[PDB]
Design a protein around this nucleic acid. Structure first.
Lengths: 129, 216, 82, 104, 65, 71, 122, 218
RNA sequence: AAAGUUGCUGCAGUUAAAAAGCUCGUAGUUGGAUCU
RNA sequence: AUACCGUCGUAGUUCCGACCAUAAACGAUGCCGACCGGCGAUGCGGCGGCGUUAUUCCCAUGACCCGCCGGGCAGCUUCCGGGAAACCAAAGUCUUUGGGUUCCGGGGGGAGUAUGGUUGCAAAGCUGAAACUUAAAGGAAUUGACGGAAGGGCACCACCAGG
């Protein structure tokens, strides 16, 4: 059955991006998916999206641009020390110039560079590049 | 047409479409053709939206006229049902026609008797003319094709949805394509009808040639 | 591509597909750079200006090139609405 | 190029009074002279220190250019059924892995 | 053709172990006027002159000269 | 595939050691019968007394007699 | 036997393709036209490529040839090429339509046509 | 002496086309080896990667013919790989050189750390797969050289990458698969999209479109 | 160390070595969305 | 010739009640879930219907025809992508490597052997080594030396008619 609604959503986004689609429908939605796509969007990979509020678990319709290469989930959510953050960005990211690792802190769901700025570490959620 | 009143459909051209049978498509329907078709019948034959066909003719004319040298366009037809029309299209426009068998490697093989490098490709039937489409895929040619309801849209860049099984449909589609590329070129006024009358372009069908020779 | 000094130190910046934003490859021989003529608004005359569309090899292989061209021309107003 | 039937451009030639103008009659002669590339080297003994010269232009024992050229020249003395060609006219630098595969 | 095109030359080199025969056959060119080869064309090689592209008639013109 | 949770350590480590017993070189090191059947007894060198001389026959494509000794 | 070799066929096709104007069905003029055109060495070769030319223009009057392609083709194919009938079969006095195609006309805002005749799919 | 066959060759022969990047930018096929012989000239070096003798089975029995893998490359520039199967090995090498000139491809070069100086490494870790052989290139710090097997070492020096970590998977013994695989990766260097290349592309007129008036005259 | 031939990073299981004959089932492992 | 072929023939093959638990028990493809091409047939259920038949049915109703939905059994085709390839819409979304979980393989033999435990009336089953031994064993696809495979075709240095 369905564990992890962020794994399903990122896999759907990745495949519908690989096939060149302009829009994606991801169901179910979740606060962690909304914030993941938000921090995707703030960096200029994913662009606009929409939340169709069914009274059950609603859907998200994502407008895509071809700027994305890979959106992936890291399961299980390992606990990322700040002393451990370079050995995770040397393993998941393709460069030292671009790409991000999404990690969740008590300060919120954010990227690895904003985590370095705010000095806090957290669990990992996924990556996008 | 960019919603221009000059470029829009005319009643005479409606009558020409309805008389030709261009709207009357085939029985089967490929899925990528569903955008150009409205609905099939209780008979089993789909009906082509003629305004989409007209707009695709306008887009193809905009593509062809955009080439500076008229000899760059290679205009091809292998099936007899359109071999004659393609010839006068060259005489209408100045493109280089391929009638009959198309030698494989015409667009790729540089040490070849018949080797040529076009900038565009205009094709009667993508089902029958499978070879020049792939040879366009090797050497970067945009392709215009006169696609039926059941037509593979591989390697076509403009698909003009029309009947191409009949002779009258092929001839008339080639006729309005030639008329429109000349009108965009400016050698004919859009107001006055074209003097070249479309029954010239139709297939001759040698038995019909003979019965027309006795009927003289 | 752009070092911190300020030179755009790269051989060339390849064109990108106007349908799916992919990088047009150097040996992407099914690539299309197609020019579509722009008309005169009142007369129906070819002005001499055109709009350019790039199609990658993959979309043209799948047969979705004509749909991409139609939606591009419609969004650019070469095709009327509907 | 080599077709038996040929097409002649004799019509489009404008004027040619001097057909034998001294431009294409350059007497190519290098076989019996010392400008022949196909000549013995008159070999030098190998230095004991393992290299030749001083400073920064030291061409050593294991130089890739010299070793490759020696590998091709050593390839020239194979069995007659072996097909070599003209690797001396063009400059070959044939490496030890390639030459060892061929020699084997 | 072989008689005036190739130049068969057979020689014997005398080495320490024996003799090697050497056969050099150089096919000369068709150099006509040239004293490099024989003027005579190869009995099969034919050359066809391209047409002097004459003026297509437009109007019957009578010009007195 | 693999058990890949966050509380899955003892299952993974048990799986590692159980399957590592199917490794030939590891089992040869650690079953301990390969060091009890070993004639040298895990020694780089042994010392012996010659019992007899032996001519061992060569293997098929090679034709010779190899000079061995039973010590 | 008597089968034309590659060179005779190839030279004859080239003589067909270019200088098509000056040639004809008689052999002997075809025998004398090649000496001003081609620098052909032997007379026995001239006579063989000039026989294939007459044999090939006998084949020309049977129609198109799968080996040559010249945009002259005498002056007869041009005349039937641009043949125009007096009245087109397209300009029909009454054109048959299908009621769902009549709906197509209705919603393509040309609902006021009169030259159409509509029948049910019986 | 070269005068061409193709329209691209005629444009290259005259001074209309200034660099080989104009050909790459429109992804035009390079059908004459003399284009690459003209634009780069003597900057192309070549290394014979392998000569393997294959004995073909014929009605005449068994005949030896050599297959040449030859990699040419303009250092800090371009790279290509060619294979030929021919009777004699010098002709096999020259034919492989001819095919390797038509196989030439630009490589993108980037920085590992701070973007200082001229680029030295692959912009991002790329992978190239050819028939069970996978070659992965990882960006590497300045001065580290090329840590790799001899085959992709030769190919990456002739491509002009000064430094690269390399990891291979598969049956890398087959030098053909291994060479074609690292060639795949260094083609995927420009086949990739990075946020450097996010600006909207202005379309410049194609050389066929720009110089069609000169092409009419010939 | 090479061995991504012990694989957590990071192997494999149609045909090369390999998926239990099949289903139930406890401990174990895992587990939808939802509250500033 | 003891395999081979034809003639009889016991246990067995059948049923009833207990053991046995193994098969090429094979889709040679764990189970659960998400995304990812097209087509046109089939089964079951449902929905929408020009028209056709219950001797024209008097209302519903069964049987054909055109679709649409859901869950299946399978086929065709594709440059979705994989793959050593055969092939596969999953064997895809795998160096751009992380949805959950179970079992299981580690060059070939010895060997599914010995020993021990356990189940079984028994035969057997489940679990299950080592010593020693070899540089290969194996998987997909490509040709054909050769057919002890079949056709043509050639020649007054072969034949027919003859000289």
């Amino acid at each position: 059955v369905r564990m992890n609604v962020l794994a399903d959503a990122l896999k759907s986004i990745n495949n519908a991006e690989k096939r060149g689609k302009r829009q994606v429908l991801i169901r179910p939605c979740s606060k962690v998916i909304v914030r993941f796509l938000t921090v995707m969007m703030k960096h200029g990979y994913i662009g606009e999206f929409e939340i169709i509020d069914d009274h059950r678990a609603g859907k998200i319709v994502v407008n895509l641009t071809g700027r994305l290469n890979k959106c992936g989930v890291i399961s299980p959510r390992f606990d990322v020390q700040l002393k451990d953050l370079e050995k995770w960005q040397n393993n998941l990211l393709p460069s030292r110039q671009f790409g991000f690792i999404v990690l969740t802190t008590s300060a919120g769901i954010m990227d690895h560079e904003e985590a370095r700025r705010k000095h806090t570490g957290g669990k990992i959620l996924g990556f996008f590049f | 047409s960019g919603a221009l009143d000059v470029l829009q459909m005319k009643e005479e051209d409606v009558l020409k479409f309805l008389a030709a049978g261009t709207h009357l498509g085939g029985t089967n329907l490929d899925f990528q053709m569903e955008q150009y078709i409205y609905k099939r019948k209780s008979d089993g034959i789909y009906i082509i939206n003629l305004k989409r066909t007209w707009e695709k003719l306008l887009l193809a004319a905009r593509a062809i006229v955009a080439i500076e040298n008229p000899a760059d366009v290679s205009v091809i037809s292998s099936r007899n049902t359109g071999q004659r029309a393609v010839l006068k299209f060259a005489a209408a426009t100045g493109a280089t026609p391929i009638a009959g068998r198309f030698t494989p490697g015409t667009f790729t093989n540089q040490i070849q008797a018949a080797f040529r490098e076009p900038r565009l490709l205009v094709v009667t039937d993508p089902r029958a003319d499978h070879q020049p489409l792939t040879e366009a895929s090797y050497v970067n040619l945009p392709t215009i094709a006169l696609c039926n309801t059941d037509s593979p849209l591989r390697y076509v860049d403009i698909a003009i949805p029309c009947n191409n099984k009949g002779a009258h449909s092929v001839g008339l589609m080639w006729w309005m394509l030639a008329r429109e590329v000349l009108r965009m070129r400016g050698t004919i006024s859009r107001e006055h009808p074209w003097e070249v009358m479309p029954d010239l372009y139709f297939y001759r069908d040698p038995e019909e040639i003979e019965k027309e020779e006795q009927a003289a | 591509m752009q070092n911190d000094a300020g030179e755009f130190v790269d051989l060339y910046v390849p064109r990108k597909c106007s349908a799916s934003n992919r990088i047009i490859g150097a040996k992407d021989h099914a690539s299309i750079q197609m020019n579509v003529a722009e008309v005169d608004k009142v007369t129906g005359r070819f002005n001499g200006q055109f709009k350019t569309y790039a199609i990658c090899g993959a979309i043209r292989r799948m047969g979705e090139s004509d749909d991409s061209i139609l939606r591009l021309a419609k969004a650019d107003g070469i095709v009327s609405k509907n | 190029g080599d077709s038996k039937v040929s097409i002649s451009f004799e019509n489009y030639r404008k004027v040619h009074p001097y057909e034998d103008s001294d431009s294409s009659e350059d007497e190519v002669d290098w076989q019996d002279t010392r400008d022949d590339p196909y000549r013995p080297a008159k070999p030098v003994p190998t230095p004991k220190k393992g290299f030749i010269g001083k400073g920064k232009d030291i061409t050593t024992k294991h130089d890739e250019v010299v070793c490759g050229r020696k590998n091709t020249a050593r390839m020239e003395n194979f069995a007659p059924e072996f097909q070599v060609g003209d690797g001396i006219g063009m400059d070959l630098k044939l490496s030890n892995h390639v030459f060892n595969a061929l020699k084997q | 053709p072989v008689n005036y095109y190739v130049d068969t030359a057979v020689r014997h080199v005398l080495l320490r172990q024996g003799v090697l025969g050497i056969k050099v056959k150089i096919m000369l060119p068709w150099d006509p006027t040239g004293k490099i080869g024989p003027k005579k064309p190869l009995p099969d090689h034919v050359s066809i002159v391209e047409p002097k592209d004459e003026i297509l008639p437009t109007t019957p013109i009578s010009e007195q000269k | 595939g693999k058990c890949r949770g966050l509380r899955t350590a003892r299952k993974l480590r048990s799986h590692r050691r159980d399957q590592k017993w199917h490794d030939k070189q590891y089992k040869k090191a650690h079953l301990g019968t390969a060091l009890k059947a070993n004639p040298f007894g895990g020694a780089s060198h042994a010392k012996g007394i010659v019992l007899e001389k032996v001519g061992v026959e060569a293997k098929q494509p090679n034709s010779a007699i190899r000079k061995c000794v039973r010590v | 036997g008597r089968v034309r070799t590659k060179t005779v066929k190839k030279a004859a096709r080239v003589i067909i393709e270019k200088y098509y104007t000056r040639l004809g069905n008689d052999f002997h003029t075809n025998k004398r036209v090649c000496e001003e055109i081609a620098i052909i060495p032997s007379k026995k070769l001239r006579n063989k490529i000039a026989g294939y030319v007459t044999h090939l223009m006998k084949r020309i009057q049977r129609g198109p040839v799968r080996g040559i392609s010249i945009k002259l083709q005498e002056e007869e194919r041009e005349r039937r090429d641009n043949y125009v009938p007096e009245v087109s079969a397209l300009d029909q006095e009454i054109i048959e339509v299908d009621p769902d195609t009549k709906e197509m006309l209705k919603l393509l805002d040309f609902g006021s046509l009169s030259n159409l005749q509509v029948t049910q799919p019986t | 002496e070269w005068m061409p066959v193709t329209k691209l060759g005629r444009l290259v022969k005259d001074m209309k086309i200034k660099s080989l990047e104009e050909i790459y930018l429109f992804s035009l096929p390079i059908k004459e080896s003399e284009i690459i012989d003209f634009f780069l000239g003597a900057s192309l070096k070549d290394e014979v990667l392998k000569i393997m003798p294959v004995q073909k089975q014929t009605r005449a029995g068994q005949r030896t013919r050599f297959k040449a893998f030859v990699a040419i490359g303009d250092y800090n520039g371009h790279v290509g790989l060619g294979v030929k199967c021919s009777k004699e090995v010098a002709t096999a090498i020259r034919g492989a050189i001819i095919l390797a000139k038509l196989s030439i491809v630009p490589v993108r070069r980037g920085y590992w750390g701070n973007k200082i100086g001229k680029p030295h490494t692959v912009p991002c870790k790329v992978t190239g797969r050819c028939g069970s052989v996978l070659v992965r290139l990882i960006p590497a710090p300045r001065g580290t050289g090329i840590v790799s097997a001899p085959v992709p070492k030769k190919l990456l020096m002739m491509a002009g990458i000064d430094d690269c970590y390399t990891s291979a998977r598969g049956c890398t013994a087959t030098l053909g698969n291994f060479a074609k695989a690292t060639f795949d990766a260094i083609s995927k260097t420009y086949s990739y999209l990075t946020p450097d290349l996010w600006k909207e592309t202005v379309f410049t007129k194609s050389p066929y479109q720009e110089f069609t008036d000169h092409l009419v005259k010939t």
